[PDB]
């Protein structure tokens, strides 16, 4: 439970654990809530059932959210959660990009079929999937956000904020929609929590690639925090902004093959002209 808490968005923003005071803050928070350190630091399966129910009630009341989901049970085997199976299937589908597309499809199919059987080998495959890449993805995303805040990578660039790396921590993860969307959405709220007045602009993020895609960047973006939605639909326009940047003359070396419009590939040389063109688009919509 301790390791599960320390990579989440909510407890990281509440305790500010990218700073030096984070360990002291989370220890004081656990003391206030009434949970022992040994309970948080042993494996969650090891606790007795009543103790588990008490701890889950306390943390549910602390997080204060209306989330509910489906659970599947089969015989005397362990109970599973649809949200956890969804994460495992997604990370077997989308990574690594050096494997072929049909092999990734078949891997996701096998992981999805493993959840509806009690067989020992299938459940062992599922637990290995949980305890390697699902943990590693969360840890890499948290490290990206922490390095960004601590070394001040995010700068204002007119009507938007810009983020750029020296190096990406793991390039197999950079091309995943799950990784990109989760990391950028975490990063903008973490940056805006440090100081007032940061809620009214979008964030643009760039990651570099090496090896067989040396000289290329992956580019995406997130709407401002202060935006109001008229209903529950969560409309965005940054993919439209990138698309209208592509129409300008003289042309830029942009690859726009994905089904999602707010992820593109850009040549490294055209970064300066891309920044100026995107500023022209956002300013022309500000006019």
């Amino acid at each position: 439970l301790f390791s599960a808490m320390m990579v989440s968005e909510y407890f990281s923003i509440k305790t500010k654990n990218w700073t030096q005071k984070g360990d002291v803050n989370i220890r004081h928070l656990l003391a206030q809530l009434g949970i022992t350190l040994h309970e948080t630091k042993q494996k969650f399966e090891a606790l007795p059932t009543e103790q588990r129910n008490l701890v889950v009630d306390v943390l549910e009341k602390e997080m204060d959210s209306s989330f509910a989901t489906f659970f599947g049970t089969l015989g005397y085997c362990g109970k599973l959660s649809a949200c956890d199976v969804a994460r495992a299937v997604t990370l077997r589908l989308e990574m690594p990009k050096s494997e072929t597309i049909m092999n990734r499809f078949r891997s996701g199919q096998s992981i999805l079929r493993s959840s509806i059987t009690g067989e020992r080998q299938d459940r062992l495959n599922l637990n290995n999937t949980f305890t390697s890449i699902c943990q590693r993805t969360l840890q890499v995303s948290w490290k990206t956000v922490a390095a960004a805040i601590n070394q001040s990578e995010i700068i204002p660039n007119g009507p938007y904020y810009l983020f750029s790396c020296s190096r990406s921590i793991d390039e197999d993860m950079v091309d995943s929609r799950h990784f990109l969307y989760n990391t950028a959405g975490f990063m903008i709220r973490a940056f805006a929590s440090m100081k007032k007045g940061r809620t009214t602009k979008p964030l643009i993020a760039m990651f570099p690639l090496t090896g067989e895609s040396a000289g290329w960047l992956v580019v995406t973006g997130v709407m401002p925090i202060a935006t109001i939605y008229e209903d529950s639909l969560l409309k965005t326009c940054i993919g439209r902004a990138f698309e209208r940047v592509k129409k300008m003359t003289p042309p830029l070396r942009i690859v726009d093959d994905y089904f999602n419009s707010d992820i593109i590939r850009l040549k490294s040389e055209d970064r300066t002209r891309f920044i100026d063109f995107l500023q022209t688009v956002f300013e022309g919509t500000s006019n």
Binding site: V24, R27, H28, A31, G34, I35, T36, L37, H38
Partner: protein, 111 residues
């Protein structure tokens, strides 16, 4: 002003008389009051309540008390007098009082 039971003991051999039940209850009340209310001079903070909070944050089970704070005018000079003369009897009472102070601020500490 009610009678101070403890101040009349100052000349005795204190080992023989801190086993008296009316004395032990009085010492146990006053040490809890000392833990709850002592102020360092020039400071506005309850020092030992802050120390219990930082102890509970680390899940430790022993608390350090300064003899200077016990023997100052805002402490309890009768307890500071009695303590080097009968430590085996006195430390048990202070352990009991400290346990009762901690268990009210943090009910989970029995686990």
């Amino acid at each position: 002003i009610p009678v101070d039971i403890l101040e009349n003991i100052r000349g005795r051999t204190i080992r023989d008389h801190v086993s008296d039940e009316a004395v032990a209850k009085e010492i146990e009340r006053r040490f809890k009051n000392f833990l709850r209310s002592f102020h360092e001079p020039g400071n506005k903070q309850t020092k030992y309540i802050q120390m219990i909070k930082s102890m509970a944050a680390d899940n430790r089970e022993s608390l350090e008390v300064s003899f200077t704070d016990l023997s100052d005018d805002n402490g309890e000079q009768n307890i500071s007098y009695f303590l080097p003369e009968a430590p085996n009897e006195m430390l048990a009472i202070m352990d009991r009082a400290a346990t009762e102070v901690v268990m009210n601020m943090y009910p989970f500490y029995s686990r």
